[PDB]
Design a protein around this ligand. Structure first.
Ligand SMILES: COc1cccc(OC)c1CNC(=O)c1cc([C@@H]2NC(=O)NC(C)=C2C(=O)Nc2ccc3[nH]ncc3c2)ccc1F
Lengths: 58, 339, 628
């Protein structure tokens, strides 16, 4: 299994595909998340409760 | 020795990946979200109580109409509820008692479920004659079915205790693609919103990103210290959240290829069974093994709410596509709808 | 208080009870009386392939029983033309060339013995053993089998199961009454031994032994031994249910009538021999053969009764001196000196002597001198009155010859040697067996009691020796039932069922709950409900691999236990009623009472099996196991 030469080679070729992707700064990734949340918070019933009127469970 | 050569080459490649990631860590999510306003507290209270299952509940799924949901129980049945009325629409005796997961398809035409039988079974809801039968038995896995999600009415994706995930062609029952790479039982999967990628969480404490169509693993996230039991995409396909026996949920960014946040507290010790984001992503809800569901603020990490009306484990939960509601299902035979 | 079959649901538990035990084979079921009865009702009526074979089995069976040679030529022709020739003429003979060639050749040689078609018997069996047998098991007829077996395996008898009548016999340890088993009507003797009177005279082995001896010789349906159908007890009494003989014993009748002629003695000796054969064939010696242990039935035929002093020689053979005094052989009386069949043959001699000439040949002139009768039997043969014919003379000296290896019966062919004596030259031995000979004596139609002797105790250490006395002889019970209530109970129960199926295509509830899933076993049990009250409620249960569900009549199940919850499963007593005690995780307890011993046995077994597997399974499934 790990005695397998084919398995060791498969593994190495995988870590290759994973080592060679494009990355972005976290600073960046964090902003786009924050952005999304703002863009859609007025659309999100759990974030800001809407009155009995529209909510089906009352 | 060439076997020895490949062992180092994989060791140095993990280092290459470790350094490449640190090189992107120029800032934290917690820094970047420091001045945006809190959420307040989330007044969430039981609305409906879905009464029926005669034993522990293991799993549930909302239909896309944000109204129906399927649930799966130790009692050997699926139950399809209309949550507005609490009326059972269908009750389904399974052929194996050892069911463990279930899924409502997006069209509302089919559900799937499975478990210790190592099979994903597709049930059809309205046939020509108009009654509920097994339309397929997707066999091929060599270990329990842990989770399953439809892409549409003819393809479905499953995860298993055999450490693989798989893609199926329902019309022919063929196992068209096979996703290997995990080294422990796979527990949970989540589909991206485009359905071209999905993520898996496993008992090897690693989660993985997969490409549906090309059949390979694009990315591996780690850092949990224990079984990942649950996984869910952030509503924009660019990150996901995981829950684990380590008593923490985490947020991993896809494009930064790494962990952004831990959600945890010193006085929470039980493991997590289930995770879901609210519609906008701000709220991360987690079902816990101390009988509660927690609402976290995804962006800040502060604990923001509690859902507490179950006398046993919250095994599963779910938010509707319309953001209006949360199901929690429990080892105490009950589902509850909250808002 | 008549027999009541369980409902057919009983099939779920019984088919598994039997299967665990290896009993669902053609061999085991076909050789049971009610088993054969049901399997053939199935073949003849509910399957056109098997009908021929069974009809053929039966014609051959009837053929074996024909008495005359005249009758067998006529019949063998009929059978061959009907079940063999005609079948070949239309290419549907599934039998050996060997089997046809056996018969063909005998018939044209006009040869017709009762075992003529024996080789078809094996081959008809092989033709039924396979597909027909499996299709039988599919049928409602095997359901009916399970229903009748549930009753068999659930028999527990008490004096109340019998309507006891008047005294017909008595000895040291108790009395025999005649009686009627209410169940079925069947008439029987009931022997009743007082346990206290036993303890005192200190013969528990002796009571125990009679039961064990009865149980060795009681199959076979032998007309010349008084056999056992059941045995049970109470705190106070042992009970044997034996063949009813209400014509008294020979001792009485001998003293009544006087001594017997030779032709009249010829009759008693025949019938007695056949019983001896039977016992000897089952490796049993009687040892106490004497006129008083020969009972006459209502017409005059006799039987050997009372196996108290009998003994098994299938392994160790007896050495010790046992029996009455002028009937004990030499090898008997020599302690240390072993023996077997030998002594009966001797006794027979003394016994037959005594019927002709009024006293044991070794009881000289009214003497009541044990050690005299002993010592003369040891080393002196007897001038047999000049009046005995040569043939009787020959017989008696054959039987009484002191040396075991020059004595009749004990020269390696047994009863056969005795049947060949000139004394029985005139007898046809199948007509003796069939009781077709006229008995000399027809018993004519209709303060011995026990003073309360001893204030003795009956301990837990006493009642432990009789732990294994209770028993039922299956072949007896089935035979009893076959010929009394079997048909009327079967049709009554057919109606009871066919009506309830009609009432369910009305009242809604049909589509069967157990079917289609992974249900392991279902059936009725009762639980306590009301905790503060504790009365039993009967429900229908369903065992799945990870839970136990039940429901009342009408609505589907609304309660259960999980195999996960269950920690242990053990027997317990409630109201002197054996129940199952389930201990549950909370410290809680759950009590189950089943309706018959097989059900208790199987529910205990499958529950234990289910929960052990469920727990070993669940602790390798992260989403199912308990976490710390
Ligand atoms: C039963 O225990 C043993 C065991 C060995 C020897 C022995 O003799 C002392 C004994 C004691 N026998 C008895 O006590 C006993 C003996 C008898 C009668 N006495 C006797 O010597 N022989 C016989 C044949 C007796 C007798 O009448 N038995 C009997 C049996 C079956 C029957 N069916 N229909 C009638 C009928 C009658 C009746 C009842 C008894 F309880």
């Amino acid at each position: 299994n790990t005695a397998s030469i084919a398995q060791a080679r498969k593994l190495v070729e995988q870590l290759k595909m994973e080592a060679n992707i494009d990355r972005i700064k976290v600073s960046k990734a964090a902003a786009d998340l924050m952005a999304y949340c703002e863009a859609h918070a007025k659309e999100d019933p759990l974030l800001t409760p809407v009155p009995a009127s529209e909510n089906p469970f009352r | 020795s060439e076997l020895d050569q490949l062992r180092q080459e994989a060791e140095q490649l993990k280092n290459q990946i470790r350094d490449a990631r640190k090189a992107c860590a120029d800032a934290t999510l917690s820094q970047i979200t420091n001045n945006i306003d809190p959420v307040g507290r989330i007044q969430m209270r039981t609305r409906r109580t879905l009464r029926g299952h005669l034993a522990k509940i293991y799993a549930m799924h909302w239909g896309t109409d944000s109204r129906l949901l399927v649930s799966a129980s130790q009692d050997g049945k699926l139950i399809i509820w209309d949550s507005y009325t609490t009326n059972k629409v269908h009750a389904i005796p399974l052929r194996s008692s050892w069911v463990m997961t279930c899924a409502y398809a997006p069209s509302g035409n089919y559900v799937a479920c499975g478990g210790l039988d190592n099979i994903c079974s597709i049930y059809n809801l309205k046939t020509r004659e108009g009654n509920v039968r097994v339309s397929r038995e997707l066999a091929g896995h060599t270990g329990y079915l842990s989770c399953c999600r439809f892409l549409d009415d003819n393809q479905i994706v499953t995860s298993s205790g055999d450490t693989t995930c798989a893609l199926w062609d329902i019309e022919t029952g063929q196992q068209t693609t096979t996703f290997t790479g995990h080294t422990g039982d796979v527990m949970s999967l989540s589909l991206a919103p485009d359905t071209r990628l999905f993520v898996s969480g496993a008992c090897d404490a690693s989660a993985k990103l997969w490409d549906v169509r090309e059949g390979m693993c694009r990315q591996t996230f780690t850092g949990h210290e224990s079984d990942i039991n649950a996984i869910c995409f952030f509503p924009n396909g660019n990150a996901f959240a995981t829950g684990s026996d380590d008593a923490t949920c985490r947020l991993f960014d896809l494009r930064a290829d790494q962990e952004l946040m831990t959600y945890s507290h010193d006085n929470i010790i039980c493991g997590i069974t289930s995770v879901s984001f609210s519609k906008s992503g701000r709220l991360l809800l987690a079902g816990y093994d101390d009988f509660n569901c927690n609402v976290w603020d995804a962006l800040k990490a502060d604990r923001a709410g509690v859902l507490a009306g179950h006398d046993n484990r919250v095994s599963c939960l779910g938010v509707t596509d319309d953001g209006m509601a949360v199901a929690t299902g429990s080892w105490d035979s009950f589902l509850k709808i909250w808002n | 208080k008549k027999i009541l079959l369980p409902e057919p649901s009983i099939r779920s538990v019984m088919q598994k009870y039997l299967e665990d035990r290896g009993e669902v084979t053609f061999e085991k079921i076909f050789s049971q009386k009610l088993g054969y009865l049901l399997f053939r009702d199935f073949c003849l009526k509910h399957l056109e392939e098997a009908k021929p074979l069974v009809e053929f089995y039966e014609e051959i069976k009837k053929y074996e029983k024909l008495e005359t040679e005249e009758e067998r030529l006529v019949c063998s022709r009929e059978i061959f033309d009907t079940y063999i020739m005609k079948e070949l003429l239309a290419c549907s003979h599934p039998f050996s060339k060997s089997a046809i060639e056996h018969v063909q050749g005998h018939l044209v040689k006009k040869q017709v013995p009762p075992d003529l078609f024996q080789p078809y018997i094996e081959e008809i069996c092989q033709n039924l053993r396979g597909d027909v047998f499996q299709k039988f098991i599919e049928s409602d007829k095997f359901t009916r089998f399970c229903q009748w077996k549930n009753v068999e395996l659930n028999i527990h008898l008490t004096m109340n199961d019998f309507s006891v009548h008047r005294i017909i016999g008595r000895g040291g340890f108790g009395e025999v009454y005649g009686c009627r088993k209410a169940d079925t009507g069947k008439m029987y003797a009931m022997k009743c031994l007082d346990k206290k009177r036993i303890k005192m005279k200190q013969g528990e082995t002796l009571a125990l032994n009679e039961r064990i001896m009865l149980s060795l010789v009681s199959t076979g349906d032998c007309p010349f031994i008084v056999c056992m159908s059941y045995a049970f007890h109470t705190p106070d009494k042992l009970s044997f249910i034996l063949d009813l003989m209400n014509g008294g014993d020979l001792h009485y009748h001998l003293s009544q009538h006087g001594v017997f002629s030779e032709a009249d003695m010829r009759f008693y000796a025949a019938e007695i021999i056949l019983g001896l054969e039977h016992m000897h064939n089952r490796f049993v010696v009687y040892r106490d053969l004497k006129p008083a242990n020969i009972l006459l039935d209502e017409h005059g035929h006799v039987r050997i009764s009372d196996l108290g002093l009998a003994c098994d020689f299938s392994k160790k053979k007896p050495h010790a001196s046992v029996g009455t005094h002028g009937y004990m052989a030499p090898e008997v009386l020599q302690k240390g000196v072993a023996y077997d069949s030998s002594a009966d043959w001797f006794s027979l001699g003394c016994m037959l002597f005594k019927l002709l000439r009024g006293h044991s040949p070794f009881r000289q002139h009214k003497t009541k001198d044990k050690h005299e009768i002993d010592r003369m039997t040891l080393t002196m043969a007897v001038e047999l009155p000049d009046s005995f014919s040569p043939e009787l003379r020959s017989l008696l000296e054959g039987l009484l010859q002191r040396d075991v290896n020059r004595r009749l019966g004990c020269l390696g062919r047994g009863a056969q040697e005795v049947k060949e004596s000139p004394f029985f030259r005139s007898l046809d031995w199948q007509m003796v067996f069939l009781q077709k000979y006229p008995p000399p004596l027809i018993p004519p139609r209709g303060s011995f009691d026990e003073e309360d002797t001893k204030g003795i105790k009956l301990l837990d250490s006493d009642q432990e020796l009789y732990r294994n006395f209770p028993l039922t002889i299956s072949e007896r019970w089935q035979q009893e039932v076959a010929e009394t209530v079997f048909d009327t109970i079967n049709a009554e129960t057919d109606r009871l069922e066919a009506r309830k199926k009609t009432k369910n295509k009305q009242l809604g509830h049909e589509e069967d709950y157990a079917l289609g899933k992974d249900c392991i076993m279902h059936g009725y049990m009762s639980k306590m409900g009301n905790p503060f009250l504790t009365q039993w409620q009967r429900r229908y249960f369903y065992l799945f691999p990870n839970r136990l569900e039940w429901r009342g009549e009408g609505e589907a199940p609304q309660s259960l236990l999980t195999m996960e919850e269950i920690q242990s499963v053990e027997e317990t007593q409630i109201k002197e009623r054996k129940c199952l005690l389930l201990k549950i995780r909370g410290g809680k307890q759950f009590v189950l009472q089943c309706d018959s011993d097989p059900e208790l046995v199987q529910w205990k077994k499958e529950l234990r099996d289910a929960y052990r597997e469920a727990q070993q399974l669940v602790q390798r499934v992260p989403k199912m196991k308990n976490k710390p």
